[PDB]
From a paper:
The C-terminal domain is connected via a linker region with the larger N-terminal domain, which is thought to be involved in circumventing the shutdown of expression of viral mRNA and stabilising the binding of the C-terminus to the ribosome. Therefore, nsp1 is considered as a potential target for antiviral drug discovery. Using sulphur and chlorine anomalous difference Fourier maps, we report the unambiguous identification of the binding orientation of four nsp1-targeting fragment hits.
We show that one fragment is able to simultaneously bind in two distinct orientations, albeit at distinct occupancies. However, our new more detailed approach employed here clearly reveals two orientations for the sulphur atom. Based on their intensity we could also estimate the occupancy for each orientation with a preference of the sulphur atom in the thiophene ring pointing towards the protein surface and establishing hydrogen bond interaction with Lys47 rather than pointing towards the solvent. As both sulphur difference peaks are located on the same ring, our approach is powerful enough to pinpoint individual atoms on a five-membered ring system with a distance of only 2.6 Å between them.
Numbering used by the authors: 10 to 76, 79 to 126
Write the structure that this text describes.
């Protein structure tokens, strides 16, 4: 199990997302996010004004962890619940959500730390 894995994540528009979060506690959302990333069933929503209030907390963000092998920006997971974050990292790339067949607008290449 390598420390990092290259993934191409489907980028979803928030209004298309059918399942708006991964669960109900910080530990669950991180766990489920990781399982969906493993299974190829995880999408990414880019954060713009109006996005977060349309998604369910706790949130799972991917944040930049370094400073980009082979096109894939190195990232790690950080969860947020009620204004508190669980992890510290760099800039947010987006919020992770389950992917259940929505049509993406792009794919985002990342090198994800499995931590
Ligand atoms: C290439 N697809 C295989 C694979 C994908 C993702 C992961 C994980 C992501 C986060 C924790 S495990 C592991 C294996």
């Amino acid at each position: 199990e390598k420390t990092h894995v290259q993934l191409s994540l489907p980028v979803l528009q928030v209004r298309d997302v059918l399942v708006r979060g991964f669960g109900d506690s910080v530990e669950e959302v991180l766990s489920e996010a990781r399982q969906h990333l493993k299974d190829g069933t995880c999408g990414l929503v880019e954060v713009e004004k109006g996005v977060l209030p349309q998604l369910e907390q706790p949130y799972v963000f991917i944040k930049r962890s370094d400073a980009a092998p082979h096109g894939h920006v190195m990232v790690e997971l950080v969860a947020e619940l009620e204004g508190i974050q669980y992890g510290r990292s760099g800039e947010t790339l987006g919020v992770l959500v389950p992917h259940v067949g929505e049509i993406p607008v792009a794919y985002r290449k990342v090198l994800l730390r499995k931590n």
